[PDB]
Amino acid sequence: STGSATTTPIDSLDDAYITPVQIGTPAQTLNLDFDTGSSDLWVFSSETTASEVDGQTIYTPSKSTTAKLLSGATWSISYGDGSSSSGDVYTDTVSVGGLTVTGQAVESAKKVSSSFTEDSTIDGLLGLAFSTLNTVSPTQQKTFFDNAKASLDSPVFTADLGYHAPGTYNFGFIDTTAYTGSITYTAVSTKQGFWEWTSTGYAVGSGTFKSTSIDGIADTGTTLLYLPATVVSAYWAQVSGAKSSSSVGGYVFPCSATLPSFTFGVGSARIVIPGDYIDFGPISTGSSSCFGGIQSSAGIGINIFGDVALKAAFVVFNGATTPTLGFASK
């Protein structure tokens, strides 16, 4: 089997991407944030504290003839950005882009943190990291991909995120029309539960490539590119007037700037992030200070190849017995 679903930016900045997901019988379609950095499929629901729902579409398990309460199971997750959610668990039928999993754990939120409430466009998350990170207790549950894998034509999914435009998540096949050149595959460590890999270096603009190992995670659920302070300083040094602002919480730059590209290495291959992908717009409405899309990972504890990086590539998440990651230009 295969599946193919369009993923759409939630706003004009590509802050996140939503993908429609069918849950239950009859289908209830929710727009979920596919997150290769976590491993829970959780949704706003009829169980979510009413004051914490503001415009989201909810899953109502009592209206699904295939929903079953997973007795005694609870979940609770905290994300790197400080947001969180928790609740109980149903199993139900979940379909993405025509690919159907029966008995998928659907984690129903009883509580969500303010940032989730405040984002009316995201109805929940669909985790695509390794199932070892799944938070369901006392019996850990599998991700949608893990459940689908054996049925897929090939045990892969691909992320093809658009810049200011829709893109695609495919399951079970590699669309050879969706990228240019070849896909370069690189090793993955699953030790931390992430799609963790090592970039071979970087360049800023038309500058020389610096060969240096940068361990990080391919994370579709993180907006920005978080890299070591040395790398980030080298990037922003090429932008007149750019500075790190403790008050704002990262590098800012004059909105009048034209940003240089940023290249990262995948083995001997190179993925170029155009400068415009690195512009996250005014820090507050009407400001001429703009927020940068490349930020320091110092104090995160991990480098994160988020959407800024991934959207410059066609990315293969190869869930073979020994997982790997592939990157192609597009």
XYZ file of C-alpha atoms in Angstrom:
330
model
C 0.000 0.000 0.000
C 0.887 3.662 -0.223
C -0.499 6.997 0.871
C -0.027 10.538 -0.371
C -1.325 13.672 1.334
C -0.809 17.349 0.746
C 0.651 19.369 3.576
C -0.144 23.073 3.772
C 1.561 25.915 5.648
C -0.591 27.251 8.479
C 0.324 30.871 7.797
C 2.304 33.158 5.529
C 5.556 32.394 7.352
C 5.423 28.606 7.071
C 5.395 28.408 10.859
C 4.105 24.864 10.609
C 2.368 22.585 8.147
C -0.948 20.795 8.472
C -2.006 17.606 6.765
C -5.572 16.268 6.745
C -6.047 12.980 8.579
C -9.182 10.850 8.646
C -9.990 9.391 12.054
C -12.827 7.059 12.903
C -15.965 5.791 11.218
C -17.512 7.756 9.643
C -14.330 9.710 9.058
C -13.627 12.780 11.132
C -11.026 14.824 9.294
C -8.575 16.729 11.466
C -5.633 18.797 10.299
C -2.575 17.475 12.074
C 1.002 18.675 12.360
C 3.165 15.810 11.130
C 6.115 15.802 13.484
C 9.197 13.697 12.807
C 10.512 14.892 16.166
C 7.890 13.187 18.337
C 5.963 9.950 18.469
C 2.445 10.633 19.718
C -0.642 11.018 17.554
C -2.789 13.302 19.682
C -5.871 15.328 18.897
C -8.120 17.998 20.213
C -11.249 16.148 21.202
C -14.674 16.230 22.794
C -12.736 15.525 26.020
C -10.543 18.617 25.806
C -11.176 21.189 28.530
C -13.671 23.511 26.848
C -11.817 26.730 27.690
C -8.721 25.296 25.988
C -10.469 24.790 22.647
C -10.578 27.847 20.394
C -11.451 27.070 16.786
C -9.836 23.653 16.414
C -11.688 20.753 14.895
C -12.221 18.048 17.503
C -12.314 14.285 17.415
C -15.399 12.896 19.103
C -14.766 9.225 19.790
C -18.366 8.544 20.839
C -19.380 9.306 17.231
C -16.943 6.778 15.790
C -18.216 3.226 15.570
C -14.640 1.928 15.398
C -13.304 3.863 18.408
C -12.440 1.869 21.502
C -11.165 3.270 24.777
C -7.723 1.870 25.503
C -8.438 0.971 29.083
C -6.220 2.607 31.660
C -3.991 4.317 29.127
C -2.934 7.921 29.561
C -0.419 10.156 27.862
C 1.403 13.363 28.642
C 3.935 15.134 26.480
C 6.102 18.213 26.771
C 7.766 19.656 23.690
C 11.029 21.547 23.311
C 9.177 24.833 22.821
C 7.613 24.532 26.277
C 4.179 23.470 25.054
C 2.411 20.375 26.354
C -0.712 18.271 26.288
C -2.130 15.183 27.981
C -5.155 12.918 28.106
C -6.454 9.425 27.520
C -6.298 7.050 24.581
C -8.564 5.415 22.052
C -7.766 3.055 19.267
C -9.436 3.829 15.976
C -9.018 3.718 12.229
C -6.700 6.398 10.904
C -6.105 7.164 7.257
C -3.587 9.501 5.658
C -3.770 10.186 1.969
C -5.485 6.876 1.270
C -3.301 4.741 3.568
C -5.311 3.180 6.376
C -4.203 1.836 9.741
C -6.693 0.053 11.939
C -6.189 0.019 15.679
C -4.068 3.167 15.724
C -3.637 4.782 19.120
C -5.362 8.133 18.974
C -4.417 10.141 22.030
C -7.340 12.322 23.044
C -6.366 15.554 24.777
C -8.003 16.411 28.044
C -5.582 19.321 28.518
C -3.486 21.368 26.135
C -1.158 24.269 26.872
C -1.930 27.802 25.808
C 0.142 27.750 22.625
C -1.988 24.904 21.268
C -5.230 26.636 22.225
C -4.020 29.819 20.595
C -3.334 28.109 17.274
C -6.701 27.415 15.729
C -5.153 25.833 12.626
C -3.593 22.781 14.301
C -5.993 20.082 15.467
C -3.251 17.867 16.913
C 0.048 16.206 16.080
C 0.951 13.049 14.228
C 4.310 11.846 15.464
C 6.734 10.253 13.035
C 9.807 9.794 15.212
C 10.575 6.356 16.642
C 7.948 4.645 18.750
C 10.370 4.430 21.681
C 9.473 8.086 22.377
C 5.731 7.456 22.549
C 4.383 8.674 25.893
C 1.404 6.362 26.384
C 1.445 4.664 29.764
C 1.419 1.958 30.965
C 1.608 0.380 27.503
C 3.608 2.362 24.969
C 1.941 2.701 21.572
C 3.242 2.665 18.017
C 3.299 5.545 15.587
C 1.153 5.618 12.493
C 4.222 4.873 10.376
C 5.293 1.989 12.585
C 1.801 0.475 12.332
C 1.636 0.997 8.570
C 5.169 -0.078 7.758
C 4.689 -3.765 7.099
C 1.860 -3.028 4.657
C 3.719 -0.364 2.726
C 5.248 -1.109 -0.655
C 8.534 0.170 0.802
C 9.111 0.994 4.495
C 9.589 4.712 3.931
C 7.888 8.030 4.096
C 8.956 11.253 2.457
C 8.607 14.898 3.392
C 8.431 17.447 0.599
C 7.618 20.700 2.359
C 6.898 23.800 0.320
C 8.227 27.306 0.722
C 5.167 29.500 1.041
C 3.275 26.747 -0.751
C 1.771 23.321 -0.181
C 3.888 20.195 -0.309
C 3.484 16.471 0.155
C 3.919 13.627 2.606
C 4.124 10.261 0.872
C 4.072 6.877 2.558
C 5.436 3.706 1.030
C 7.058 5.049 -2.117
C 9.565 7.535 -3.419
C 8.180 9.880 -6.067
C 11.101 10.105 -8.438
C 9.509 13.127 -10.140
C 9.590 15.168 -6.927
C 13.311 15.930 -6.784
C 16.257 16.764 -8.978
C 19.494 14.835 -9.206
C 20.011 11.952 -6.824
C 19.032 11.230 -3.255
C 22.013 11.050 -0.916
C 21.457 8.730 1.996
C 23.126 9.174 5.337
C 23.262 7.180 8.566
C 20.744 7.565 11.357
C 21.124 6.979 15.074
C 17.875 6.007 16.764
C 19.456 6.053 20.231
C 17.534 9.167 21.285
C 14.377 8.150 19.400
C 14.884 10.757 16.683
C 15.853 10.782 13.036
C 19.320 11.819 14.157
C 22.082 12.184 11.585
C 25.356 14.029 11.006
C 25.658 16.789 8.475
C 29.079 17.095 6.875
C 29.302 20.886 7.075
C 27.994 24.179 5.854
C 28.520 27.270 3.759
C 27.157 30.784 4.074
C 26.090 32.401 0.822
C 28.720 31.995 -1.866
C 31.363 31.317 0.781
C 33.611 28.302 1.010
C 32.204 25.102 2.432
C 33.349 24.301 5.964
C 33.747 20.579 6.513
C 32.622 19.846 10.044
C 30.367 17.229 11.588
C 27.055 18.567 12.848
C 24.891 16.019 14.631
C 21.232 16.906 14.607
C 17.701 15.738 14.033
C 15.441 15.945 11.012
C 12.374 17.481 12.615
C 9.379 18.487 10.537
C 7.671 19.667 13.727
C 10.213 22.406 14.421
C 9.924 25.573 12.359
C 13.494 26.835 12.357
C 17.040 25.607 11.822
C 18.889 25.378 15.138
C 22.647 24.966 14.834
C 25.764 25.499 16.950
C 26.469 29.050 17.987
C 29.656 29.183 15.935
C 27.773 28.303 12.735
C 24.916 30.666 13.460
C 27.273 33.544 14.244
C 29.082 32.947 10.964
C 25.785 33.130 9.106
C 24.443 36.299 10.710
C 27.803 38.047 10.448
C 27.063 38.231 6.722
C 23.904 40.276 7.318
C 24.465 43.955 8.034
C 22.790 44.968 11.252
C 21.933 41.446 12.392
C 22.343 40.775 16.082
C 21.337 38.341 18.752
C 18.634 39.872 20.906
C 18.140 38.387 24.356
C 14.885 40.345 24.704
C 13.469 38.938 21.475
C 14.987 35.481 22.008
C 17.324 35.069 19.065
C 18.923 36.622 16.058
C 17.063 39.465 14.448
C 17.975 41.394 11.350
C 16.823 44.494 9.488
C 13.762 43.634 7.447
C 15.335 45.613 4.593
C 18.102 43.017 4.273
C 18.484 40.509 1.488
C 19.610 37.332 3.266
C 22.362 35.036 2.044
C 21.670 31.391 1.406
C 22.807 28.676 3.773
C 24.157 25.353 2.528
C 24.342 22.175 4.573
C 26.168 18.998 3.687
C 24.682 15.548 3.360
C 27.653 13.325 2.743
C 29.324 14.784 -0.340
C 26.039 16.383 -1.421
C 24.877 19.898 -0.648
C 21.422 21.288 0.110
C 21.044 25.018 -0.433
C 18.535 26.934 1.663
C 17.723 30.168 -0.203
C 18.073 33.334 1.842
C 14.381 34.117 1.639
C 13.615 30.881 3.505
C 15.462 32.336 6.501
C 13.193 35.399 6.842
C 10.515 34.985 9.515
C 9.219 38.498 9.253
C 8.703 41.332 11.701
C 9.265 40.489 15.345
C 5.958 42.244 16.089
C 3.440 43.770 13.735
C 4.845 46.811 11.973
C 8.398 46.348 13.233
C 11.348 46.744 10.880
C 13.269 44.149 12.883
C 12.780 40.687 11.431
C 13.235 37.314 13.107
C 15.873 34.972 11.747
C 15.213 31.448 10.594
C 18.625 30.164 11.656
C 19.072 30.252 15.423
C 21.483 28.902 17.980
C 20.880 25.473 19.458
C 22.987 26.352 22.492
C 20.994 25.313 25.532
C 18.573 23.177 23.479
C 21.063 20.354 23.806
C 20.575 19.194 20.223
C 20.838 20.654 16.741
C 17.568 20.671 14.870
C 17.143 20.566 11.113
C 13.633 21.956 11.192
C 11.374 23.123 8.423
C 13.720 25.887 7.264
C 16.228 23.218 6.289
C 13.907 20.394 5.335
C 11.769 22.463 2.979
C 14.846 23.054 0.808
C 14.996 19.303 0.168
C 13.095 16.194 -0.718
C 13.623 14.098 2.407
C 13.373 10.340 2.692
C 12.718 8.835 6.101
C 13.807 5.268 5.452
C 12.359 2.987 8.102
C 14.143 -0.154 6.964
C 15.597 -2.442 9.644
C 18.545 -0.065 9.767
C 16.958 3.339 9.253
C 18.579 6.008 7.122
C 17.749 9.485 5.861
C 17.907 10.624 2.279
C 18.129 14.168 0.969
C 17.764 15.449 -2.564
C 17.576 18.918 -4.013
C 14.301 19.811 -5.703
